[PDB]
Design an enzyme around this catalytic site. Structure first.
Site, mmCIF file in Angstrom:
data_model
loop_
_atom_site.group_PDB
_atom_site.id
_atom_site.type_symbol
_atom_site.label_atom_id
_atom_site.label_comp_id
_atom_site.label_asym_id
_atom_site.label_seq_id
_atom_site.Cartn_x
_atom_site.Cartn_y
_atom_site.Cartn_z
ATOM 1 N N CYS A 1 0.853 -1.171 0.000
ATOM 2 C CA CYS A 1 0.000 0.000 0.000
ATOM 3 C C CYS A 1 0.897 1.232 0.000
ATOM 4 O O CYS A 1 1.365 1.646 1.059
ATOM 5 C CB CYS A 1 -0.937 0.011 1.211
ATOM 6 S SG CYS A 1 -2.047 1.424 1.161
ATOM 7 N N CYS B 1 -0.609 4.228 2.157
ATOM 8 C CA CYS B 1 -0.779 4.107 3.592
ATOM 9 C C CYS B 1 -0.341 2.797 4.219
ATOM 10 O O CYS B 1 0.793 2.634 4.661
ATOM 11 C CB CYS B 1 -2.187 4.467 4.071
ATOM 12 S SG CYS B 1 -3.427 3.556 3.219
ATOM 13 N N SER B 2 -1.257 1.831 4.266
ATOM 14 C CA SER B 2 -0.991 0.600 5.017
ATOM 15 C C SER B 2 -1.975 -0.537 4.729
ATOM 16 O O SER B 2 -1.895 -1.596 5.348
ATOM 17 C CB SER B 2 -0.995 0.890 6.528
ATOM 18 O OG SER B 2 -2.228 1.479 6.933
ATOM 19 N N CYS B 3 -2.880 -0.311 3.789
ATOM 20 C CA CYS B 3 -3.914 -1.286 3.422
ATOM 21 C C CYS B 3 -3.397 -2.714 3.265
ATOM 22 O O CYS B 3 -2.369 -2.950 2.638
ATOM 23 C CB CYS B 3 -4.647 -0.813 2.168
ATOM 24 S SG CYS B 3 -5.059 0.913 2.479
HETATM 25 CO CO LIG Z 1 -2.992 1.539 3.332
#
Ligand SMILES: [Co+2]
Lengths: 229, 204
Positions: free
Chosen positions: B107, B110-112
Site C-alpha cells: 500500500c 498508507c498501510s492497506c
Molecule cells: Co494503506
C-alpha cells in the site's frame, strides 16, 4: 493532496527496519489507538476515506518517523476538532495531567453491550464499500487508458507516480465509494473501479525493469481512453 | 536513520502515552469508547484473526483445484467457504505465483492489508521504506531485504492497493510436498509468502 505520505517511488527513505519477530501491539497505548477507530467511526467522526485524509494532513516529518498508530491518533484529533466533538484546549490540559500523573484513573464510565456488538459485527461482517450505480462501466479489460494529471488539494487516491501515465485495464470490479468525494465530506458518490497495469518502463523511464509491472486501482474519473480493442 | 532533531524513543513513548490517555479519557466521557471495547478489539487481532487463516485458504487452494479456481475468481466469496472474511477484506483478490510470474503487494499510500486472512500488518509493511521502494525496485528489494532472488527473466507484478480491493498472494506450492496433509502444508505458508516478499518455506 500531494503529501509526503504518497511515497511510492520516493528515494532516500533508508533501509527497511524488520525485526525477526514483533508483537501485534508494542505498547498498551497502541491497543487504545487501534480500538478508537471503530469508536470514532461509529460516533460519526469520520468514514474510512476521511480517516486517511486526516493522516495525509500530518506534519510530514512527524509522519515519516512516528510510530504507526500515532498517525491514527492525529486523525482522530483532526476530525474531533473538525466536527467540534473534541475541544483542543481541554485535550492539551488533560495531556499535561496524564504527563504528570501517568497512573491516574480514566473517567468512570458504564460498559456498553452495543459497542461490543458493533465491534464483533464490523470485524466479522466487514464494512463493504461496494455500491450499485445506475450507469454501466465506461471501460473494459484491454482498454488502454491514461491516468489523470489532476492534482486535487483534498483527499484522492492519485499517487504521484502514476499521474499522466498510460496503462491497460486489467479488471472491472464494480462500483465503490469514491475517495475524492467521500474523503472530503462530500459523500459516497460511487464510481466504477478498475485495476490498471502500468509497465515499470512507463513508470520509471527507459532504464526501468522490462519485466515488471505495477497494478494500480483507478476509479473511473481517474482514467480516460487512449484506445479500446 | 539518524535524525539529530529527534527525541529518544523513551521520551517519544512517554509523550505519546500521555497524549493517548488524554484523548481516551475524553472519548470515554463522550460515551463512545469503553475499556471493554478496547479489550475486545485487541483480543480479536492478537488471538483470533491472523495469518493462520490465510494459510488454511492457501493449503485448500493447493489441494483443491476447483476451490483454487473459485479463489482466483472471487476471493471474498471463496474465503467465506472457510468462514473467513470481514473487516478490511470485504473485497479480496488473490493472485497466483507461477514459474512465469511473481506477485508482491503494497500500500504505497498508507498501510492497506487483508486483515481477515493475515491479521494486522507487521510494522515494516506500513513503514515508508518498504512502501517507497517496492514499486520502484521490487527485484532488488526482494533480494537485498528478504534474501529472495527473482530471476530477471521472471516477471514481477507489484500490486498497489489504492482502493478497497485487497490483494493476496497465493504462493507456489514448494517442491517435495506431494500428498502432504493440509496441516503439514500449512506449516510452509507464512504471512510473508502471502505478501509476496518471500516464497513459501522450502521443505529442507
Ligand atoms: Co494503506
Amino acid at each position: 493532496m500531494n503529501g509526503v505520505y504518497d511515497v511510492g517511488g520516493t528515494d532516500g527513505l533508508g533501509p527497511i527496519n524488520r525485526p525477526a519477530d514483533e508483537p501485534v501491539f508494542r505498547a498498551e497505548w497502541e491497543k487504545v489507538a487501534f480500538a478508537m477507530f471503530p469508536a470514532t467511526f461509529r460516533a460519526g467522526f469520520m468514514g474510512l476515506d476521511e480517516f486517511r485524509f486526516g493522516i495525509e494532513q500530518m506534519n510530514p516529518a512527524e509522519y515519516l518517523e512516528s510510530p504507526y498508530y500515532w498517525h491514527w491518533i492525529r486523525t482522530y484529533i483532526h476530525h474531533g476538532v473538525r466536527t467540534g466533538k473534541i475541544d483542543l484546549e481541554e485535550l492539551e490540559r488533560r495531556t499535561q495531567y496524564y504527563r504528570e500523573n501517568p497512573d491516574a484513573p480514566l473517567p468512570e464510565h458504564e460498559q456498553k453491550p452495543e459497542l461490543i456488538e458493533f465491534v464483533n459485527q464490523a470485524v466479522y461482517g466487514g464494512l463493504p464499500a461496494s455500491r450499485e450505480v445506475d450507469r454501466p462501466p465506461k471501460f473494459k479489460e484491454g482498454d488502454v487508458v491514461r491516468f489523470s494529471t489532476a492534482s486535487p488539494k483534498g483527499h484522492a487516491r492519485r499517487a504521484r507516480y502514476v499521474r499522466g501515465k498510460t496503462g491497460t485495464v486489467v479488471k472491472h470490479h464494480g462500483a465503490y465509494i469514491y475517495p475524492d468525494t467521500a474523503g472530503n465530506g462530500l459523500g459516497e458518490c460511487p464510481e466504477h473501479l478498475y485495476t490498471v497495469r502500468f509497465t515499470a518502463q512507463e513508470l520509471w523511464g527507459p532504464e526501468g525493469d522490462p519485466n515488471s509491472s505495477v497494478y494500480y486501482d483507478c476509479w473511473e474519473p481517474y482514467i480516460e481512453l487512449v484506445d479500446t480493442k | 536513520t539518524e535524525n539529530i532533531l529527534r527525541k529518544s524513543d523513551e521520551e517519544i513513548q512517554k509523550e505519546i502515552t500521555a497524549r493517548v490517555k488524554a484523548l481516551e479519557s475524553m472519548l470515554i466521557e463522550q460515551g463512545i469508547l469503553t475499556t471493554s471495547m478496547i479489550d475486545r478489539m485487541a483480543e480479536i487481532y492478537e488471538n483470533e484473526v491472523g495469518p493462520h487463516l490465510g494459510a488454511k485458504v492457501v493449503v485448500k487452494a493447493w489441494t483443491d483445484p476447483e476451490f483454487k479456481k473459485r479463489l482466483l475468481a472471487d476471493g471474498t466469496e471463496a474465503c467465506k467457504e472457510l468462514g473467513i472474511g470481514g473487516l478490511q477484506g470485504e473485497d479480496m483478490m488473490w493472485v497466483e505465483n507461477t514459474d512465469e510470474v511473481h506477485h508482491v503487494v503494497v500500500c504505497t499510500l498508507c498501510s492497506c492489508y487483508p486483515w481477515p486472512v493475515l491479521g494486522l500488518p507487521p510494522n515494516w509493511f506500513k513503514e515508508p521504506q518498504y512502501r517507497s521502494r517496492v514499486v520502484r525496485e521490487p527485484r532488488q528489494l526482494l533480494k537485498e531485504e528478504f534474501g529472495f532472488e527473482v530471476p530477471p527473466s521472471k516477471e514481477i507484478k507489484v500490486w498497489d492497493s489504492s482502493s478497497e480491493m485487497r490483494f493476496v498472494v497465493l504462493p507456489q506450492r514448494p517442491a517435495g510436498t506431494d500428498g502432504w496433509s493440509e496441516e503439514e502444508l500449512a506449516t510452509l505458508v507464512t504471512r510473508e509468502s502471502m505478501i509476496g516478499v518471500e516464497p513459501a518455506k522450502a521443505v529442507a
